Protein backbone atom coordinates (compact mmCIF):
# COMPACT_ATOMS: atom_id res chain seq x y z
CA UNK A 1 0.00 0.00 0.00
CA UNK A 2 1.42 3.36 -1.07
CA UNK A 3 2.24 5.46 2.00
CA UNK A 4 0.48 8.82 2.45
CA UNK A 5 2.21 11.94 1.09
CA UNK A 6 3.10 12.98 4.66
CA UNK A 7 4.76 9.67 5.60
CA UNK A 8 8.31 10.27 4.35
CA UNK A 9 10.54 13.32 4.44
CA UNK A 10 11.05 13.99 0.74
CA UNK A 11 7.36 13.52 0.01
CA UNK A 12 6.58 16.14 2.66
CA UNK A 13 9.17 18.51 1.17
CA UNK A 14 7.72 18.01 -2.32
CA UNK A 15 4.20 18.68 -1.04
CA UNK A 16 5.39 21.83 0.75
CA UNK A 17 7.22 23.19 -2.30
CA UNK A 18 4.25 22.39 -4.56
CA UNK A 19 1.92 24.23 -2.18
CA UNK A 20 4.31 27.19 -2.10
CA UNK A 21 4.43 27.29 -5.90
CA UNK A 22 0.63 27.03 -6.07
CA UNK A 23 0.07 30.26 -4.08
CA UNK A 24 1.72 32.49 -6.70
CA UNK A 25 0.24 31.09 -9.93
CA UNK A 26 -2.83 33.30 -9.42
CA UNK A 27 -2.12 37.06 -9.48
CA UNK A 28 -4.73 39.80 -9.11
CA UNK A 29 -5.36 42.73 -11.49
CA UNK A 30 -5.53 45.27 -8.65
CA UNK A 31 -1.76 44.82 -8.16
CA UNK A 32 -1.03 44.89 -11.91
CA UNK A 33 -3.35 47.68 -13.10
CA UNK A 34 -0.78 50.41 -13.78
CA UNK A 35 2.56 48.58 -13.88
CA UNK A 36 3.92 47.70 -17.31
CA UNK A 37 7.36 46.21 -18.10
CA UNK A 38 7.31 47.19 -21.78
CA UNK A 39 8.86 50.67 -22.15
CA UNK A 40 6.64 53.36 -23.64
CA UNK A 41 7.15 57.00 -24.54
CA UNK A 42 5.45 59.49 -22.23
CA UNK A 43 4.61 63.20 -22.34
CA UNK A 44 5.92 65.03 -19.26
CA UNK A 45 5.11 68.58 -20.41
CA UNK A 46 2.57 69.11 -17.62
CA UNK A 47 5.26 68.54 -14.97
CA UNK A 48 8.43 69.83 -16.70
CA UNK A 49 7.89 73.30 -15.24
CA UNK A 50 10.80 74.92 -13.40
CA UNK A 51 11.62 78.47 -12.28
CA UNK A 52 12.96 80.55 -15.14
CA UNK A 53 16.76 80.81 -15.33
CA UNK A 54 17.53 84.51 -15.76
CA UNK A 55 20.83 85.24 -17.52
CA UNK A 56 22.35 88.73 -17.66
CA UNK A 57 25.53 89.80 -19.47
CA UNK A 58 27.63 92.50 -17.84
CA UNK A 59 29.45 95.00 -20.10
CA UNK A 60 32.79 93.25 -19.47
CA UNK A 61 31.51 89.85 -20.64
CA UNK A 62 30.79 88.51 -17.16
CA UNK A 63 27.70 86.30 -16.99
CA UNK A 64 25.19 86.17 -14.12
CA UNK A 65 22.60 83.38 -14.13
CA UNK A 66 20.06 82.74 -11.37
CA UNK A 67 17.37 80.13 -10.78
CA UNK A 68 15.29 81.69 -8.02
CA UNK A 69 13.06 79.69 -5.65
CA UNK A 70 12.24 82.25 -2.96
CA UNK A 71 10.36 79.67 -0.87
CA UNK A 72 13.60 77.81 -0.12
CA UNK A 73 15.52 78.37 3.10
CA UNK A 74 19.02 77.92 1.64
CA UNK A 75 20.75 79.16 -1.49
CA UNK A 76 24.00 78.43 -3.29
CA UNK A 77 26.19 80.95 -5.12
CA UNK A 78 29.11 79.81 -7.23
CA UNK A 79 31.60 80.99 -9.81
CA UNK A 80 32.26 78.81 -12.86
CA UNK A 81 35.28 79.54 -15.06
CA UNK A 82 35.77 77.96 -18.48
CA UNK A 83 39.53 77.66 -17.84
CA UNK A 84 40.88 74.31 -16.64
CA UNK A 85 43.97 72.14 -16.91
CA UNK A 86 43.80 71.86 -20.71
CA UNK A 87 44.38 75.57 -21.41
CA UNK A 88 47.78 75.56 -19.68
CA UNK A 89 51.29 74.92 -21.00
CA UNK A 90 53.70 72.02 -20.61
CA UNK A 91 55.83 74.00 -18.15
CA UNK A 92 52.83 74.83 -15.92
CA UNK A 93 50.64 71.72 -15.67
CA UNK A 94 49.74 71.54 -11.97
CA UNK A 95 48.98 75.26 -11.76
CA UNK A 96 45.19 74.80 -11.77
CA UNK A 97 45.28 72.27 -8.92
CA UNK A 98 47.78 74.36 -6.97
CA UNK A 99 45.63 77.48 -7.38
CA UNK A 100 42.44 75.71 -6.34
CA UNK A 101 44.29 74.50 -3.24
CA UNK A 102 45.77 77.95 -2.50
CA UNK A 103 42.69 80.07 -3.21
CA UNK A 104 41.03 79.41 0.17
CA UNK A 105 44.20 80.10 2.19
CA UNK A 106 44.93 83.80 1.92
CA UNK A 107 43.60 87.23 0.95
CA UNK A 108 44.75 90.81 1.44
CA UNK A 109 41.72 91.38 3.71
CA UNK A 110 41.30 87.97 5.39
CA UNK A 111 43.89 85.32 6.18
CA UNK A 112 43.11 81.60 6.06
CA UNK A 113 42.02 81.48 9.71
CA UNK A 114 39.72 84.50 9.37
CA UNK A 115 38.24 83.20 6.11
CA UNK A 116 37.51 79.78 7.61
CA UNK A 117 36.00 81.41 10.71
CA UNK A 118 33.76 83.61 8.55
CA UNK A 119 32.66 80.60 6.49
CA UNK A 120 31.92 78.51 9.59
CA UNK A 121 30.11 81.29 11.47
CA UNK A 122 27.33 81.70 8.90
CA UNK A 123 26.82 77.92 8.70
CA UNK A 124 27.36 77.56 4.97
CA UNK A 125 30.38 75.89 3.43
CA UNK A 126 32.27 76.48 0.19
CA UNK A 127 33.83 73.88 -2.11
CA UNK A 128 35.91 74.04 -5.27
CA UNK A 129 37.16 71.71 -7.96
CA UNK A 130 38.94 71.90 -11.31
CA UNK A 131 38.15 69.62 -14.24
CA UNK A 132 40.17 69.36 -17.45
CA UNK A 133 38.08 72.16 -18.97
CA UNK A 134 36.21 73.80 -16.06
CA UNK A 135 37.00 75.31 -12.66
CA UNK A 136 34.30 75.98 -10.07
CA UNK A 137 34.27 77.67 -6.66
CA UNK A 138 30.80 77.50 -5.10
CA UNK A 139 29.32 78.07 -1.65
CA UNK A 140 26.13 76.81 -0.01
CA UNK A 141 24.68 79.19 2.60
CA UNK A 142 21.43 80.12 4.28
CA UNK A 143 19.28 82.56 2.31
CA UNK A 144 20.44 85.47 4.51
CA UNK A 145 24.15 84.85 3.81
CA UNK A 146 24.05 85.15 0.01
CA UNK A 147 25.65 88.65 -0.12
CA UNK A 148 28.37 87.53 2.30
CA UNK A 149 29.11 84.41 0.25
CA UNK A 150 29.21 86.44 -2.96
CA UNK A 151 31.57 88.97 -1.37
CA UNK A 152 33.83 86.15 -0.14
CA UNK A 153 33.90 84.58 -3.61
CA UNK A 154 34.78 87.88 -5.31
CA UNK A 155 37.42 88.56 -2.66
CA UNK A 156 39.10 85.17 -3.09
CA UNK A 157 39.05 85.35 -6.90
CA UNK A 158 40.46 88.89 -7.12
CA UNK A 159 42.21 90.05 -3.93
CA UNK A 160 43.92 86.70 -3.25
CA UNK A 161 47.47 86.94 -1.89
CA UNK A 162 49.69 83.85 -2.01
CA UNK A 163 52.04 83.75 0.97
CA UNK A 164 55.32 81.96 0.26
CA UNK A 165 55.21 80.02 3.54
CA UNK A 166 51.69 78.91 2.58
CA UNK A 167 52.83 77.99 -0.94
CA UNK A 168 55.51 75.73 0.55
CA UNK A 169 53.02 74.02 2.87
CA UNK A 170 50.54 73.48 0.04
CA UNK A 171 53.32 72.04 -2.12
CA UNK A 172 54.17 69.64 0.71
CA UNK A 173 50.53 68.62 1.19
CA UNK A 174 50.12 68.06 -2.56
CA UNK A 175 53.24 65.88 -2.63
CA UNK A 176 51.69 63.97 0.27
CA UNK A 177 48.45 63.65 -1.73
CA UNK A 178 50.55 62.11 -4.53
CA UNK A 179 40.32 53.93 -6.04
CA UNK A 180 42.51 53.41 -9.14
CA UNK A 181 39.54 54.42 -11.29
CA UNK A 182 40.94 57.94 -11.62
CA UNK A 183 44.36 56.41 -12.30
CA UNK A 184 42.89 54.28 -15.09
CA UNK A 185 41.07 57.28 -16.55
CA UNK A 186 44.20 59.45 -16.38
CA UNK A 187 46.22 56.79 -18.19
CA UNK A 188 43.44 56.39 -20.76
CA UNK A 189 43.35 60.15 -21.40
CA UNK A 190 47.15 60.29 -21.68
CA UNK A 191 47.28 57.37 -24.13
CA UNK A 192 44.29 58.56 -26.19
CA UNK A 193 44.83 62.32 -26.44
CA UNK A 194 48.62 62.00 -26.45
CA UNK A 195 50.72 65.02 -27.45
CA UNK A 196 47.64 67.21 -26.91
CA UNK A 197 46.57 69.36 -23.95
CA UNK A 198 43.88 66.88 -22.87
CA UNK A 199 46.57 64.21 -22.50
CA UNK A 200 48.08 65.91 -19.46
CA UNK A 201 46.67 64.94 -16.08
CA UNK A 202 44.86 67.52 -13.96
CA UNK A 203 47.16 67.22 -10.94
CA UNK A 204 50.36 67.63 -12.94
CA UNK A 205 53.90 66.29 -12.55
CA UNK A 206 55.92 66.78 -9.39
CA UNK A 207 58.73 68.55 -11.26
CA UNK A 208 56.36 71.32 -12.35
CA UNK A 209 54.60 71.27 -8.96
CA UNK A 210 57.84 71.99 -7.10
CA UNK A 211 58.60 75.15 -9.12
CA UNK A 212 55.19 76.82 -8.67
CA UNK A 213 55.55 80.25 -7.06
CA UNK A 214 53.37 83.29 -6.39
CA UNK A 215 54.23 84.86 -9.75
CA UNK A 216 53.08 81.77 -11.65
CA UNK A 217 49.72 81.67 -9.86
CA UNK A 218 49.19 85.41 -10.38
CA UNK A 219 50.03 85.11 -14.08
CA UNK A 220 47.68 82.14 -14.46
CA UNK A 221 44.82 84.05 -12.81
CA UNK A 222 45.48 87.17 -14.88
CA UNK A 223 45.66 85.21 -18.14
CA UNK A 224 42.80 82.73 -17.65
CA UNK A 225 40.26 84.12 -15.15
CA UNK A 226 39.04 86.71 -17.64
CA UNK A 227 35.51 88.08 -17.34
CA UNK A 228 34.08 86.66 -20.63
CA UNK A 229 34.94 83.14 -19.37
CA UNK A 230 33.39 83.82 -15.96
CA UNK A 231 29.81 83.05 -14.89
CA UNK A 232 28.22 83.50 -11.46
CA UNK A 233 25.49 80.88 -11.01
CA UNK A 234 23.02 81.36 -8.16
CA UNK A 235 20.31 78.91 -7.17
CA UNK A 236 17.60 78.95 -4.53
CA UNK A 237 16.39 81.83 -2.36
CA UNK A 238 18.07 84.59 -4.36
CA UNK A 239 16.83 87.55 -6.38
CA UNK A 240 18.30 88.10 -9.84
CA UNK A 241 18.33 91.90 -9.52
CA UNK A 242 20.08 91.76 -6.14
CA UNK A 243 22.62 89.22 -7.43
CA UNK A 244 23.35 91.35 -10.51
CA UNK A 245 23.76 94.49 -8.38
CA UNK A 246 26.13 92.73 -5.97
CA UNK A 247 28.12 91.28 -8.88
CA UNK A 248 28.42 94.71 -10.50
CA UNK A 249 29.55 96.21 -7.19
CA UNK A 250 32.06 93.47 -6.33
CA UNK A 251 33.39 91.79 -9.50
CA UNK A 252 35.53 94.69 -10.70
CA UNK A 253 39.20 94.91 -11.79
CA UNK A 254 38.85 91.43 -13.31
CA UNK A 255 41.31 90.45 -16.02
CA UNK A 256 40.31 91.44 -19.57
CA UNK A 257 42.24 89.40 -22.14
CA UNK A 258 41.35 89.26 -25.82
CA UNK A 259 42.24 85.56 -26.05
CA UNK A 260 39.13 83.37 -26.03
CA UNK A 261 38.69 79.72 -25.12
CA UNK A 262 37.43 79.03 -28.66
CA UNK A 263 40.70 80.21 -30.20
CA UNK A 264 42.69 78.46 -27.47
CA UNK A 265 40.96 75.20 -28.44
CA UNK A 266 41.41 75.93 -32.15
CA UNK A 267 45.15 76.31 -31.61
CA UNK A 268 46.80 72.94 -30.83
CA UNK A 269 43.51 70.98 -30.69
CA UNK A 270 42.96 67.48 -29.30
CA UNK A 271 43.32 64.49 -31.64
CA UNK A 272 42.30 60.96 -30.67
CA UNK A 273 44.98 58.38 -31.49
CA UNK A 274 44.22 54.71 -30.92
CA UNK A 275 46.62 53.29 -28.35
CA UNK A 276 46.84 51.14 -25.24
CA UNK A 277 48.65 51.26 -21.90
CA UNK A 278 48.98 47.96 -20.02
CA UNK A 279 50.26 47.91 -16.44
CA UNK A 280 50.28 44.22 -15.54
CA UNK A 281 51.15 43.64 -11.87
CA UNK A 282 49.14 40.52 -10.81
CA UNK A 283 49.69 41.79 -7.25
CA UNK A 284 46.27 43.50 -7.23
CA UNK A 285 43.38 41.06 -6.60
CA UNK A 286 41.26 42.55 -9.41
CA UNK A 287 41.98 43.73 -12.95
CA UNK A 288 40.55 47.08 -14.07
CA UNK A 289 40.49 48.07 -17.74
CA UNK A 290 38.77 50.75 -19.80
CA UNK A 291 38.32 50.66 -23.58
CA UNK A 292 37.08 53.91 -25.09
CA UNK A 293 36.26 55.22 -28.55
CA UNK A 294 36.15 58.88 -29.61
CA UNK A 295 33.09 60.77 -28.40
CA UNK A 296 31.37 63.98 -29.43
CA UNK A 297 31.82 67.60 -28.46
CA UNK A 298 29.54 69.42 -26.02
CA UNK A 299 27.67 71.25 -28.80
CA UNK A 300 27.73 68.25 -31.16
CA UNK A 301 24.13 67.22 -31.98
CA UNK A 302 25.17 63.55 -31.66
CA UNK A 303 26.14 64.01 -27.99
CA UNK A 304 22.58 63.27 -26.86
CA UNK A 305 22.61 60.13 -28.99
CA UNK A 306 25.87 59.16 -27.28
CA UNK A 307 24.22 59.62 -23.88
CA UNK A 308 21.34 57.40 -25.04
CA UNK A 309 23.86 54.80 -26.22
CA UNK A 310 25.49 54.96 -22.78
CA UNK A 311 22.07 54.48 -21.20
CA UNK A 312 21.43 51.35 -23.25
CA UNK A 313 24.89 50.13 -22.17
CA UNK A 314 24.06 50.82 -18.55
CA UNK A 315 26.28 50.04 -15.60
CA UNK A 316 26.06 46.82 -13.60
CA UNK A 317 27.42 46.10 -10.13
CA UNK A 318 27.89 42.98 -8.04
CA UNK A 319 25.85 44.54 -5.21
CA UNK A 320 23.24 46.02 -7.57
CA UNK A 321 19.65 45.05 -6.82
CA UNK A 322 18.82 44.61 -10.50
CA UNK A 323 20.90 41.44 -10.66
CA UNK A 324 20.70 39.63 -13.99
CA UNK A 325 17.40 41.20 -15.11
CA UNK A 326 18.74 44.63 -16.09
CA UNK A 327 17.43 46.45 -19.14
CA UNK A 328 20.72 46.68 -21.03
CA UNK A 329 22.03 43.57 -22.77
CA UNK A 330 25.61 44.12 -21.59
CA UNK A 331 24.50 44.19 -17.95
CA UNK A 332 22.49 41.01 -18.53
CA UNK A 333 25.48 39.27 -20.10
CA UNK A 334 27.80 40.29 -17.26
CA UNK A 335 25.37 39.50 -14.44
CA UNK A 336 24.16 36.15 -15.77
CA UNK A 337 27.70 34.80 -16.20
CA UNK A 338 29.25 36.79 -13.31
CA UNK A 339 32.26 37.69 -15.45
CA UNK A 340 32.95 41.09 -13.87
CA UNK A 341 32.94 42.77 -10.48
CA UNK A 342 31.45 46.00 -11.84
CA UNK A 343 31.01 47.43 -15.34
CA UNK A 344 30.07 51.01 -16.18
CA UNK A 345 29.71 52.79 -19.51
CA UNK A 346 31.15 56.32 -19.54
CA UNK A 347 30.66 59.19 -21.99
CA UNK A 348 32.85 62.24 -21.37
CA UNK A 349 32.29 65.37 -23.47
CA UNK A 350 34.86 68.09 -24.16
CA UNK A 351 35.02 71.27 -26.22
CA UNK A 352 36.15 69.63 -29.47
CA UNK A 353 36.32 65.88 -28.76
CA UNK A 354 35.35 63.31 -26.15
CA UNK A 355 35.45 59.71 -25.02
CA UNK A 356 32.82 56.97 -25.07
CA UNK A 357 33.59 53.55 -23.67
CA UNK A 358 33.21 50.97 -20.92
CA UNK A 359 35.25 50.76 -17.71
CA UNK A 360 35.16 47.32 -16.09
CA UNK A 361 36.54 45.72 -12.93
CA UNK A 362 36.74 41.93 -13.06
CA UNK A 363 38.57 38.89 -11.78
CA UNK A 364 41.68 37.87 -13.76
CA UNK A 365 40.02 34.67 -15.01
CA UNK A 366 37.03 36.29 -16.76
CA UNK A 367 38.82 39.11 -18.60
CA UNK A 368 38.59 37.54 -22.07
CA UNK A 369 34.88 36.70 -21.79
CA UNK A 370 34.07 40.11 -20.31
CA UNK A 371 35.93 41.89 -23.12
CA UNK A 372 34.11 39.73 -25.67
CA UNK A 373 30.76 40.67 -24.12
CA UNK A 374 31.67 44.38 -24.13
CA UNK A 375 32.77 44.39 -27.77
CA UNK A 376 29.81 42.23 -28.81
CA UNK A 377 27.30 44.60 -27.24
CA UNK A 378 29.00 47.73 -28.60
CA UNK A 379 29.09 46.38 -32.15
CA UNK A 380 25.49 45.24 -31.65
CA UNK A 381 24.55 48.87 -31.05
CA UNK A 382 26.52 49.53 -34.24
CA UNK A 383 24.63 47.00 -36.38
CA UNK A 384 21.21 45.98 -34.99
CA UNK A 385 19.34 47.80 -32.22
CA UNK A 386 15.89 47.25 -30.72
CA UNK A 387 13.22 49.95 -30.61
CA UNK A 388 12.10 48.97 -27.11
CA UNK A 389 15.72 49.01 -25.94
CA UNK A 390 16.16 52.53 -27.35
CA UNK A 391 12.93 53.64 -25.68
CA UNK A 392 14.04 52.22 -22.32
CA UNK A 393 17.43 53.92 -22.70
CA UNK A 394 15.75 57.25 -23.45
CA UNK A 395 13.45 56.90 -20.44
CA UNK A 396 16.38 56.03 -18.18
CA UNK A 397 18.40 58.98 -19.50
CA UNK A 398 15.54 61.42 -18.90
CA UNK A 399 14.92 60.04 -15.42
CA UNK A 400 18.61 60.20 -14.47
CA UNK A 401 19.04 63.73 -15.85
CA UNK A 402 16.07 64.92 -13.79
CA UNK A 403 16.91 62.96 -10.62
CA UNK A 404 20.46 64.34 -10.55
CA UNK A 405 18.99 67.87 -10.37
CA UNK A 406 17.67 67.70 -6.79
CA UNK A 407 18.77 70.67 -4.72
CA UNK A 408 20.11 74.20 -4.99
CA UNK A 409 23.70 73.02 -5.42
CA UNK A 410 22.83 70.61 -8.29
CA UNK A 411 20.70 73.34 -9.89
CA UNK A 412 23.58 75.83 -9.75
CA UNK A 413 26.03 73.22 -11.04
CA UNK A 414 23.71 72.51 -13.96
CA UNK A 415 23.35 76.24 -14.69
CA UNK A 416 27.08 76.91 -14.66
CA UNK A 417 28.06 73.80 -16.60
CA UNK A 418 25.39 74.34 -19.25
CA UNK A 419 26.35 77.99 -19.72
CA UNK A 420 30.02 77.03 -20.02
CA UNK A 421 29.37 74.17 -22.47
CA UNK A 422 26.26 74.97 -24.54
CA UNK A 423 26.25 78.72 -23.94
CA UNK A 424 22.71 78.44 -22.55
CA UNK A 425 20.60 76.40 -20.14
CA UNK A 426 18.62 73.83 -22.12
CA UNK A 427 15.00 73.78 -20.88
CA UNK A 428 13.64 70.47 -19.64
CA UNK A 429 11.00 70.28 -22.39
CA UNK A 430 13.55 70.84 -25.16
CA UNK A 431 15.95 68.34 -23.59
CA UNK A 432 13.15 65.75 -23.42
CA UNK A 433 12.27 66.40 -27.06
CA UNK A 434 15.92 65.98 -28.05
CA UNK A 435 16.17 62.71 -26.10
CA UNK A 436 12.92 61.26 -27.44
CA UNK A 437 13.87 62.30 -30.99
CA UNK A 438 16.48 59.51 -30.83
CA UNK A 439 15.36 56.20 -32.32
CA UNK A 440 16.86 52.95 -33.64
CA UNK A 441 17.91 54.55 -36.94
CA UNK A 442 19.57 57.46 -35.12
CA UNK A 443 21.39 55.05 -32.79
CA UNK A 444 22.62 53.01 -35.76
CA UNK A 445 23.80 56.12 -37.62
CA UNK A 446 25.62 57.57 -34.61
CA UNK A 447 27.25 54.23 -33.79
CA UNK A 448 28.38 53.91 -37.41
CA UNK A 449 29.84 57.42 -37.21
CA UNK A 450 31.61 56.88 -33.88
CA UNK A 451 32.21 53.14 -33.35
CA UNK A 452 32.17 51.16 -36.60
CA UNK A 453 35.75 50.36 -37.65
CA UNK A 454 37.14 53.09 -35.38
CA UNK A 455 40.35 52.89 -33.38
CA UNK A 456 40.06 52.18 -29.66
CA UNK A 457 42.14 53.27 -26.67
CA UNK A 458 42.61 50.68 -23.92
CA UNK A 459 44.03 51.42 -20.46
CA UNK A 460 44.39 48.33 -18.27
CA UNK A 461 45.93 47.71 -14.85
CA UNK A 462 46.18 44.64 -12.64
CA UNK A 463 46.36 40.92 -13.47
CA UNK A 464 45.74 41.72 -17.15
CA UNK A 465 47.14 38.53 -18.64
CA UNK A 466 44.02 36.96 -20.17
CA UNK A 467 42.94 40.37 -21.49
CA UNK A 468 42.97 40.34 -25.31
CA UNK A 469 45.51 42.60 -26.99
CA UNK A 470 44.86 45.60 -29.25
CA UNK A 471 44.35 43.72 -32.52
CA UNK A 472 41.64 41.57 -30.92
CA UNK A 473 39.60 44.61 -29.89
CA UNK A 474 40.23 46.32 -33.24
CA UNK A 475 38.91 43.29 -35.11
CA UNK A 476 35.94 42.99 -32.72
CA UNK A 477 35.06 46.63 -33.48
CA UNK A 478 33.14 45.43 -36.57
CA UNK A 479 31.10 42.38 -37.54
CA UNK A 480 31.77 40.25 -40.61
CA UNK A 481 28.25 38.78 -40.59
CA UNK A 482 27.16 41.64 -42.86
CA UNK B 1 65.42 54.33 -6.23
CA UNK B 2 61.75 54.28 -7.22
CA UNK B 3 60.99 51.31 -9.53
CA UNK B 4 60.67 52.22 -13.20
CA UNK B 5 57.31 50.47 -13.55
CA UNK B 6 55.96 52.14 -10.41
CA UNK B 7 57.12 55.56 -11.61
CA UNK B 8 55.54 54.98 -15.03
CA UNK B 9 52.25 53.90 -13.45
CA UNK B 10 52.12 56.81 -10.99
CA UNK B 11 53.14 59.42 -13.62
CA UNK B 12 50.79 59.28 -16.63
CA UNK B 13 52.53 61.51 -19.16
CA UNK B 14 51.00 62.90 -22.34
CA UNK B 15 54.35 62.58 -24.15
CA UNK B 16 54.51 58.86 -24.98
CA UNK B 17 57.61 57.43 -26.66
CA UNK B 18 57.39 54.21 -28.67
CA UNK B 19 60.14 52.01 -30.11
CA UNK B 20 60.08 53.45 -33.66
CA UNK B 21 63.17 51.44 -34.67
CA UNK B 22 61.41 49.60 -37.51
CA UNK B 23 58.01 51.36 -37.55
CA UNK B 24 58.08 55.15 -37.94
CA UNK B 25 54.86 56.48 -36.42
CA UNK B 26 52.76 59.16 -38.05
CA UNK B 27 53.09 62.63 -36.48
CA UNK B 28 50.46 63.20 -33.77
CA UNK B 29 47.37 64.60 -35.46
CA UNK B 30 47.23 62.92 -38.85
CA UNK B 31 44.25 60.59 -39.42
CA UNK B 32 44.64 56.83 -39.37
CA UNK B 33 45.39 55.43 -42.83
CA UNK B 34 43.20 52.34 -42.63
CA UNK B 35 41.62 52.55 -46.09
CA UNK B 36 44.96 52.04 -47.85
CA UNK B 37 45.81 48.95 -45.79
CA UNK B 38 42.35 47.50 -46.38
CA UNK B 39 42.69 48.02 -50.13
CA UNK B 40 46.15 46.42 -50.21
CA UNK B 41 44.60 43.45 -48.42
CA UNK B 42 41.76 43.58 -50.96
CA UNK B 43 44.22 43.23 -53.84
CA UNK B 44 45.82 40.30 -52.06
CA UNK B 45 42.37 38.78 -51.66
CA UNK B 46 41.79 39.25 -55.39
CA UNK B 47 44.94 37.20 -55.91
CA UNK B 48 44.02 34.49 -53.38
CA UNK B 49 40.48 34.10 -54.72
CA UNK B 50 41.84 33.71 -58.26
CA UNK B 51 44.27 31.00 -57.13
CA UNK B 52 41.63 29.12 -55.12
CA UNK B 53 39.12 29.23 -57.98
CA UNK B 54 41.62 28.02 -60.57
CA UNK B 55 42.92 25.23 -58.32
CA UNK B 56 39.39 23.98 -57.63
CA UNK B 57 38.44 24.09 -61.31
CA UNK B 58 41.69 22.37 -62.29
CA UNK B 59 41.00 19.49 -59.91
CA UNK B 60 37.36 19.18 -60.99
CA UNK B 61 38.13 19.25 -64.71
CA UNK B 62 40.97 16.77 -64.21
CA UNK B 63 38.41 14.45 -62.63
CA UNK B 64 36.16 15.25 -65.63
CA UNK B 65 36.34 13.59 -69.05
CA UNK B 66 39.55 13.31 -71.08
CA UNK B 67 40.55 14.09 -74.65
CA UNK B 68 40.87 10.40 -75.54
CA UNK B 69 37.27 9.53 -74.66
CA UNK B 70 36.11 12.86 -76.12
CA UNK B 71 37.71 12.03 -79.48
CA UNK B 72 36.54 8.40 -79.46
CA UNK B 73 32.94 9.68 -79.28
CA UNK B 74 33.08 11.17 -82.80
Amino acid sequence: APPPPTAMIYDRAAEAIKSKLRQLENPDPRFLKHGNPRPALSDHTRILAAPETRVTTLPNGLRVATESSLAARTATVGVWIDAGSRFETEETNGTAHFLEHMIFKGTERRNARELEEEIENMGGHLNAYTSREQTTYYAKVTDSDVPQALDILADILQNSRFEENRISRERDVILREMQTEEVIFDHLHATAFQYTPLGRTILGPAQNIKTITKAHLQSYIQTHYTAPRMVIAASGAVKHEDIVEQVKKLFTKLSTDATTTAQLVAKEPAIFTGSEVRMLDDDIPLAQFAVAFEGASWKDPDSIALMVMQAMLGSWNKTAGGGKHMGSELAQRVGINEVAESIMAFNTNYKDTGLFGVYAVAKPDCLDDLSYAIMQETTKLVYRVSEDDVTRACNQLKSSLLLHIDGTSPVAEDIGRQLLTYGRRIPFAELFARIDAVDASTIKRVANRFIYDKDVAIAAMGPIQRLPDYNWFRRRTYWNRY
Amino acid sequence: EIPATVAAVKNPSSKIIYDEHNHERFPPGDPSKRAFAYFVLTGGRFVYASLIRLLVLKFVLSMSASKDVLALAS
Binding site: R384, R481, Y482 | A49, R53, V56, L57
Partner: peptide, 24 residues
Protein backbone atom coordinates in the same frame (compact mmCIF):
# COMPACT_ATOMS: atom_id res chain seq x y z
CA UNK C 1 17.86 41.12 -41.64
CA UNK C 2 16.08 40.90 -45.00
CA UNK C 3 18.53 43.30 -46.67
CA UNK C 4 21.54 41.51 -45.18
CA UNK C 5 20.22 38.14 -46.36
CA UNK C 6 19.57 39.54 -49.84
CA UNK C 7 23.07 41.01 -50.08
CA UNK C 8 24.61 37.74 -48.89
CA UNK C 9 22.58 35.86 -51.49
CA UNK C 10 23.85 38.28 -54.13
CA UNK C 11 27.42 37.67 -52.94
CA UNK C 12 26.92 33.89 -53.05
CA UNK C 13 25.48 34.13 -56.56
CA UNK C 14 28.45 36.24 -57.66
CA UNK C 15 30.84 33.68 -56.19
CA UNK C 16 29.02 30.86 -57.96
CA UNK C 17 29.12 32.72 -61.28
CA UNK C 18 32.83 33.35 -60.74
CA UNK C 19 33.46 29.66 -60.05
CA UNK C 20 31.29 27.95 -62.68
CA UNK C 21 31.33 30.90 -65.14
CA UNK C 22 28.31 30.04 -67.27
CA UNK C 23 28.57 32.27 -70.36
CA UNK C 24 31.09 34.37 -68.36
Amino acid sequence: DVKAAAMWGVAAATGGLYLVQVSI
